[PDB]
């Protein structure tokens, strides 16, 4: 039987400072006991001073990030180049994830 999910490993870490924030992640990509890449970027600058990482199943993670980056682009078009606040991005990402409530993006996401 076809299993649409996989596990690409990795780990991510976000810490909020008083006037700054960090989002870290290892660059290793794996399947089972093999290494795919020793350097495969996992944390992305999505624009509007927002960084994002979707960790777990890389295919779903890349798709989510790609979709949110696209959501940012269309937010500018539709709302006169207004800056997408972090709280507004978070709520937007909730709806991106729940759109697949019955076939989930297999990722733990942090912005």
């Amino acid at each position: 039987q076809f299993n649409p999910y996989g596990d690409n490993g990795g780990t991510i870490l976000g810490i909020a400072g008083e006037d700054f924030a960090v989002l870290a992640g290892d660059t290793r990509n794996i399947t089972d006991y093999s290494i795919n890449s020793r350097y495969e970027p996992k944390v992305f600058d999505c624009g509007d001073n927002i960084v994002m990482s979707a960790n777990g199943f890389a295919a779903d993670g890349d798709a989510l990030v790609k979709r949110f980056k696209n959501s940012v682009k269309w937010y500018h078009f539709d709302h006169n180049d207004k800056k997408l606040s972090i709280n507004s991005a978070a709520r937007n990402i909730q709806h991106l994830l729940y759109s697949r409530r019955f076939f989930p993006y297999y990722v733990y996401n942090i912005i």
């Binding site: 539709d78 006169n80 978070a90 709520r91 709806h95």
Partner: protein
């Protein structure tokens, strides 16, 4: 007969141009934007004295920070208002924030040209959309059935529009207060209305950052009418 989406030899859509004529027959609605708020006022125009005038709802809330006045075939406005309210609250759902007045207006105007042979004809009503957001501040928009919307410092629509607009041309300046704008709407409404203006046949409203969108009581408007009469008699 002829297509509904047909161009005239002058390069205009017949139906859109004809809907504009219907809006000219509608009751007067005026909007004035200031740095203290935007005022919206309308002529109710009851067809009979037995008609309970307070049920005439030509000024309408879209969101806490956006209001709307209408003129023309007012029945057509109900679906536009419903769409506006839905768009405003849906954006709040998706983005956890208030929606920009311009973006709301653009969403309403996207419905306009969705007609053909979708709805069978354009809307026969014009809207004055007034509101406030953090980016562009206090704003007043005029949404037409053509799909076009202009921002205005002050605007009049309806039967006494060109006469009122000429009056708004002279009276409006960038340092107007909210109280001054209120009296100015009442003044111009009283000028273009057929019947004598009072608290029962004319309605005021405003939108401020603090209190949001508010329709004025008949008792509150009555005092502003009395305040107007005295200041006109003062010189």
């Amino acid at each position: 007969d002829r297509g509904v989406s047909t161009f005239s030899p002058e390069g205009r859509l017949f139906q859109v141009e004809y809907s504009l004529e219907a809006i000219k027959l509608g009751s007067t609605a005026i909007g004035i934007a200031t740095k203290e708020g935007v005022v919206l006022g309308v002529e109710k125009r009851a067809t009979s004295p037995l008609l309970e005038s307070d049920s005439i709802e030509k000024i309408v809330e879209i969101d806490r920070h956006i209001g709307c006045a209408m003129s023309g075939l007012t029945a057509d406005a109900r679906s536009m208002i419903e769409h506006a309210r839905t768009a405003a609250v849906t954006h709040n759902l998706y983005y956890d924030e208030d929606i920009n007045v311009e973006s709301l207006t653009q969403s309403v105007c996207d419905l306009a040209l969705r007609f053909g042979e979708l709805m069978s004809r354009p809307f026969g009503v014009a809207l004055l959309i007034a509101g406030h957001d953090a980016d562009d501040g206090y704003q007043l928009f005029h949404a037409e059935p053509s799909g076009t919307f202009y921002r205005y410092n002050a605007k009049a629509i309806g039967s006494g529009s060109e006469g009122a607009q000429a009056e708004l041309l002279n009276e409006w300046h960038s340092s107007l207060t909210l109280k001054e704008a209120e009296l100015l709407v009442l003044k111009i409404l009283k000028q273009v209305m057929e019947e004598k203006l009072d608290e029962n046949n004319a309605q005021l409203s405003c939108i401020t950052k603090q209190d949001g969108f508010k329709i004025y009581d008949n008792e509150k408007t009555a005092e502003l009418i009395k305040e107007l009469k005295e200041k006109e008699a003062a010189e």
